Design a protein around this nucleic acid. Sequence first.
DNA 1: TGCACAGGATGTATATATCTGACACGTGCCTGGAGAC
Lengths: 443, 435, 68, 436, 442
Amino acid sequence: VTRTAAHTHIKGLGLDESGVAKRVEGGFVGQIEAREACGVIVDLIKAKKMSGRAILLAGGPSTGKTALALAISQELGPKVPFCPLVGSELYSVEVKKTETLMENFRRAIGLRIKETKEVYEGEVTELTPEDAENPLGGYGKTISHVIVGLKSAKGTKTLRLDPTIYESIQREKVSIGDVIYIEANTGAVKRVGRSDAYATEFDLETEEYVPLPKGEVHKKKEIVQDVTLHDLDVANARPQGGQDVISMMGQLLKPKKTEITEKLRQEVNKVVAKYIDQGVAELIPGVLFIDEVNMLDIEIFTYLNKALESNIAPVVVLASNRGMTTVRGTEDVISPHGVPPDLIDRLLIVRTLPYDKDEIRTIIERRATVERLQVESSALDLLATMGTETSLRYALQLLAPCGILAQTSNRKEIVVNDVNEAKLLFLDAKRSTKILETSANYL
Amino acid sequence: VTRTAAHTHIKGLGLDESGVAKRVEGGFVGQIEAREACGVIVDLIKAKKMSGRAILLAGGPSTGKTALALAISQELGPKVPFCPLVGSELYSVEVKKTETLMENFRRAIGLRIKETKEVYEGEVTELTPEDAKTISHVIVGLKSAKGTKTLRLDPTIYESIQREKVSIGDVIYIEANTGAVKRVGRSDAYATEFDLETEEYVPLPKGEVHKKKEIVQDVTLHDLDVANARPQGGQDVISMMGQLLKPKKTEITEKLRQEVNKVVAKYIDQGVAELIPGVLFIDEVNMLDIEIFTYLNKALESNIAPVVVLASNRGMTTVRGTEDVISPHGVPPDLIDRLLIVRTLPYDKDEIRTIIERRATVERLQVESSALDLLATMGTETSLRYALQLLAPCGILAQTSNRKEIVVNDVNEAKLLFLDAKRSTKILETSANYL
Amino acid sequence: SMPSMDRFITESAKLRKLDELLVKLKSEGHRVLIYFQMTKMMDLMEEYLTYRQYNHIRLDGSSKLEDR
Amino acid sequence: KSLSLIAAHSHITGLGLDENLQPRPTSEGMVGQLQARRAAGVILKMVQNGTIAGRAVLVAGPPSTGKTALAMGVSQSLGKDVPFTAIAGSEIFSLELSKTEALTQAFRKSIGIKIKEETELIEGEVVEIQIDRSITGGHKQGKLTIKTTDMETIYELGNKMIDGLTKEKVLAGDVISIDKASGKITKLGRSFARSRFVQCPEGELQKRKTVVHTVSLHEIDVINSRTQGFLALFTGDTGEIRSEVRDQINTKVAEWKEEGKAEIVPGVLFIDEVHMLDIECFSFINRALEDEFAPIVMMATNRGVSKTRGTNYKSPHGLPLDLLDRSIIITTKSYNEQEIKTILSIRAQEEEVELSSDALDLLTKTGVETSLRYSSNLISVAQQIAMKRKNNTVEVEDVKRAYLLFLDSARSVKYVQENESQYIDDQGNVQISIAK
Amino acid sequence: SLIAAHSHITGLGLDENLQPRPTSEGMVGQLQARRAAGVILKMVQNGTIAGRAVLVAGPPSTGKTALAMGVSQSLGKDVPFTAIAGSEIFSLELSKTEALTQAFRKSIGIKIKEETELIEGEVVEIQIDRSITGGHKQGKLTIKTTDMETIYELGNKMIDGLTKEKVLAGDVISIDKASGKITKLGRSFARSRDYDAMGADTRFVQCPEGELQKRKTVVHTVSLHEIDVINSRTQGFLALFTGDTGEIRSEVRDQINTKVAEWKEEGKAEIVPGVLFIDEVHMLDIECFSFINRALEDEFAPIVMMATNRGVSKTRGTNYKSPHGLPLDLLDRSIIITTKSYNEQEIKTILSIRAQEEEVELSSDALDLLTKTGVETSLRYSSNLISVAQQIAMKRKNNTVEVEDVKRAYLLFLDSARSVKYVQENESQYIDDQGNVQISIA
DNA sequence: TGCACAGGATGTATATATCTGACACGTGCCTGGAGAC
Ligand SMILES: Nc1ncnc2c1ncn2[C@@H]1O[C@H](COP(=O)(O)OP(=O)(O)O)[C@@H](O)[C@H]1O
Ligand SMILES: Nc1ncnc2c1ncn2[C@@H]1O[C@H](COP(=O)(O)OP(=O)(O)O)[C@@H](O)[C@H]1O
Ligand SMILES: Nc1ncnc2c1ncn2[C@@H]1O[C@H](COP(=O)(O)OP(=O)(O)O)[C@@H](O)[C@H]1O
Ligand SMILES: Nc1ncnc2c1ncn2[C@@H]1O[C@H](COP(=O)(O)OP(=O)(O)O)[C@@H](O)[C@H]1O
């Protein structure tokens, strides 16, 4: 019916109006202090005043670090942008890692714009061009004007088209009897389909039949758009959307990432500030999430030191599970969580704690509830004891083979024999390591 | 007014007509033997006969090597090519380093071309093409403030004229030798045909219609190699927007260089051209890889190689790119067998004082004689460059208190505000947390 | 991208189930009346019928007395 | 203009100095470091005089002791029109540009050219447009009535003005600006006629306006190089500009300077975290400072006797002695309790946070105990705890709650060290099970 | 095709109770691993859960890739099975994470349902109107059956499909509307007067009778990575074959995810997950493992199967040793299947199956000798000796491999151990680690 | 004796449905304004 994958039993942080976390609500069990700190961070993000704040989630493996970031993303809502990253994604072969980090920084700042469009639309009834005096004169096009007759509901208009508009008109392969849509902001033309006023069953090109557009031919409408700053940066960097030669050739070449200079970013910031001052724009800062932060090296950390001190950069959430580890790209420095101390000085560390037997048991119970399985109480106790003995994730991932083995025996509940058979068929890390130690030829 | 940056008190080697260096001449203080050797090298370059000769000048830091190289460049004059270079500039990510080395080698060989510029400009009064669909010719009549002139033109220039949208009454610009056509604008006599218009209006040229001039073109062989080896193709004269495909550098083959040499050798024999070899100067030569050092041996044995000047301030140092090769000045011994080494000696107290006085004179500062000995003692105690770089904060602090003369209190204040390397190192050792 | 018609039909569950019932009702070859309460609730339903090219006529409050 | 939420250096408006280059105890958002502020004022006068070039200034000190804030104060006190390029140390390791080429482009972005030119504009409010056209459109007759608050006129219109007016459709009551030579018509909006909104222009219709342009040398280098157009200034793929075009630009700028057609302005290139550069970058910087077209370079680092990158030996400040011989060093110091309290007060007033006096004393105590930046960061998250229980002023227990929730470095190191079996060490050995 | 190493395996050999038969479907022995692989196969066919990592480990020559091939054969068609090696991630064109993302998204299939109309009839009249340069093309087509007669309008693609495999007014054709396919079935009129240029030797068929137009419902499976490459740029269908899909941006991927969810909501499309098999997973950097640790937690993630044969070896990209060459973060979220070595009876059954596959007839004594030498040496050597002894068998002209043929094949070709013995005996003739050799024999 | 809480009563809110109600547009015609002397 539905697809579940290691998550989606979590719907939020699960707090009341005072910020006090319940013991079990919202799909979360335990970790009260971390959830309250994440609620404070959520309120700070919703305040929309700060810039360049950062927190770090530190804890052991399998303790709920990525779960808290996904709970923050669910508590914020879909309107606030959220860019999840892994630390290995910043190394690209097309552009340096500094530009990729700045791109992901600019990808987490949203914007909402009320946009006004001048629209000519209707049904094409007359398509008549007229010619130039000397078509082989070398300079100037072949034709001079194109007369287009458009008919909408309760209206009819005639237009004398520029040839440059007619290139986009004839690139869409319009004809007499087609409903078109001309956008005067960019010159883009959309061919909607054949009109339904004529016959239907005499076509061979699986076309779509559309009634006449309501209202007049010439229109003005207001459109609310959601746009990030990185979208404006890559739109101005590779210009596609005009009707000129360069904008036409921009759509045909193979795209490649380029080092966008800071001058373009200053110009985009100036235009966005003008749009905000005009009262048609609203700025929505977001969250950038970098999981497995220990994969970064010293150069990206040193650039991140500068990039957090700008006046645009969003809230950055990191995560790591290292105790005292040398930073990558260095030889002999040793720093907590693989994060250098100059970056550590600008953070706010949120500690995460391991679980107990009862918390493991109720987590197993809720994840068996989500996966639509029925578990007996003795099998649940055995699964909780296994989770304490080996791993929480190993007891989590043994539920579905137990369900398959129960279903092959024509049963609905999960009993102790299925758990024992899944133990015997499937191994964990410790038993595999113990087998590898007592092995013959590097098993 | 004038910008002074670490140099420009050096105007030459300060030699006499017999090549004997005076003690204070050309902005140079001391350093007799290195200046005389550089004068001999300057005479050898002005001989214009030998190819691939290399010298190297070695010494301590802040001792006058780069000043000597710039003095050589000032002694040769501006018509002789001089390509400055640092050793770290050879590592490019577009082509191999040997190609960049050969490019910088061929950037130091120049040419001199005698040319003639002929220009017609003025208002168009007559534009009558004649055929025999193909125009045979076109007759254009120009007009300026000193009279008119009627010219015949081939249809090739007529195509460029109708490219520029030239009508009757526009001010144009025609180059006779190259056929370049430029439209300046409409004449001021037609400024009242409309109240509001898109055309721009310019007055008549006050000079004659026909102008002639003799010019001398200076090019290098690398410019011809670049112009003959464009990978995408040619370009127009005006291109405000670049090409859709980005042209990067390419490994230029030996065949193109041979053909360029053949064409230039043919043009020299007619007396059109004149060949001026130059100097390739590479500073900080110890930052070169062993592969570039090996390719330099091949490049120095060519027939068209210029005079190469190297500088280094290392002692017995391991060569970059190797593991257990120890050679003097960071230069491998197979290369060291091919140059002549010029030694450059350090300075004592009074020459340091005289250099400080010279830089104070150049920077338009007035220093009391009591502060000058303290500045010289400071320079001998720490560094010459630290004493030289402390003159402008001293001048600013003197000008702040409405004084136009350097008082030793300003020198003490500038010593207190700005530290040298040794005192900063002593702060580094006697500290707890990262300074 | 122009507002689609299939989406106009799938974002409303009542209209979707009405389409599913009307497919077999038209396959049976029948006659059917539908009652409404809003102006636009039948104005959009006319658009659905013209998408389905079904034969239909409309009677409401804005209709003149001769048309009835 | 210049949209910004709140920065970490947003409270600094410049160096706090008098006319005699002496630092005030607290002025323009800067507290303490009087010798560093006086030295930076001397460097600012060095830049403002503009008669010398190619000087290196190194700012060194412990971390979180006013290093980047001094550069921000210098940049704010510099004013507009003077270039200021602020790059990081690790930004020059590109994939399509060499390190020396990236350093050359960073160097040549800090020298500007001042060109003053005058144009003619027609700005006013459109009263009436009368256009007469034929059947085939071969000829068009036009009359335009335009006005200001002081004059009225009617213009007989040509063909190209008519075609430029039907394009970018103008009506009555609009306020437009027309350039005669280029034919560019800009709609400034509508006038004050209800029947965006822009007040009607006054004075003469045809004004002569002089504008002063400031163009960096790198833009002229990109434009004069014929391989790419001016769009490479925005796309960024300039791709290893050659040297002969730079020599031509230098000679042409020196030629323009004698005839008075242009003026040279120098700027400041600021390289934060200069210890991340390689040895070849240092060797290029050693020769890039000895040129007439060179700015004043400010470098900042906090390393003390660290390993130079690309070598195998340790050097003071992570820099070789050749670069340290060409530089003058400004040293910053640590702060007392009163400087920390004043800085926290300024940061509280910047973020619009009301602090009680006892909360300020607690923040000062935990600032002199651990770090300045930790106590600066605690204020904005203590204010959310204050607003959660519906209170405006931040009290003592809100700061204590924020201290309990968010950890600092010294507590986290101890919590890691007591529970080292739960984390991955340098050998990749971890224990995940609780029992046994 | 040809005979490969795993060409004898058709399925996993399991009953309805997921209990492995000892000798069935080309797989013998290894009952625990076969039962576990059947459990994984039923988990995949369920299609409910996502992002499970399965690790197959053991000694070399044990049946790991054989188990993966058996799973892929039991999976059937229309379910994507992406099988890659560890060294294919490293490229000069894409990053490691981008190549891993493409390999992940190649294993998710989307089944799209389409409504089409089939037209089969006899062509009567063709009118084609084209411009002077031949660019703008339009016209009318008059087709008939034995009952009806309809005039259709033609576009550019229809005219291009007509002017290829040229129809000549009397051919019986079939047109699919949604696919744009034109198929010339044959000629029914058999005109006498014909031009002497083309062949026009098509078969004689009858004119079709009944309805001219018929509605039909068709389905097809398209991978997610195909949709990303198609919507990436203008000519993405060429990039599906040339492989020039350089670093597709994230906005394309999330818009594709939203559109796929919309199509599942509308009932148009359904999502079919698959299996991604990474053989020799130990040849991956730690950055690839760090990316896999987060890519396994997405909803659009397939069942990842990894196989390795390393013991406690060094993880690539680091300086420490880990079990199976994998860090403990990946080993925590993975489930391990352990394969075990064989007896002589399983070796004999394997050799008999491989001899039956290669059409090689063995005597009992030759099979016993091959079983003994596969017990002593590796199994793969005795598997490889069979065809060599077969060619020796027709070199003496008898179609039965005897003991002397196996003895001659053992004489001519060497093991791993015998070559090591000869090298250690004659070390002076081979180039060693320091580049020393003795070529002269005096 | 006063106050607080709970239950009932009523207003209302916003899209309907009928349903008029007074306005703006598509055809005749004839005579008077326009051309010519
Ligand atoms: N408090 C909790 N309640 C329920 N499930 C949890 C909790 N904490 C962790 N989990 C589960 O444990 C698994 C590992 O957590 P995650 O944060 O994804 O990895 P790690 O903790 O190693 O960073 C997740 O699948 C998550 O569902
Ligand atoms: N003989 C001299 N007379 C005047 N100035 C000198 C003399 N020798 C050196 N200098 C000055 O001392 C400085 C030494 O710089 P440079 O020669 O570049 O150092 P290095 O020799 O290490 O390259 C230069 O600024 C130069 O102007
Ligand atoms: N004299 C000062 N006046 C005002 N703020 C200061 C001062 N010194 C330090 N700060 C604050 O301390 C923080 C750290 O300063 P900074 O110099 O950027 O750190 P670092 O020394 O690591 O570069 C900055 O946010 C700045 O606002
Ligand atoms: N049960 C089996 N059925 C069929 N073939 C087998 C079996 N076990 C082993 N083999 C053969 O042994 C070899 C196994 O090696 P491989 O497939 O690379 O996996 P692994 O490396 O895990 O042993 C294959 O050539 C396969 O043909």
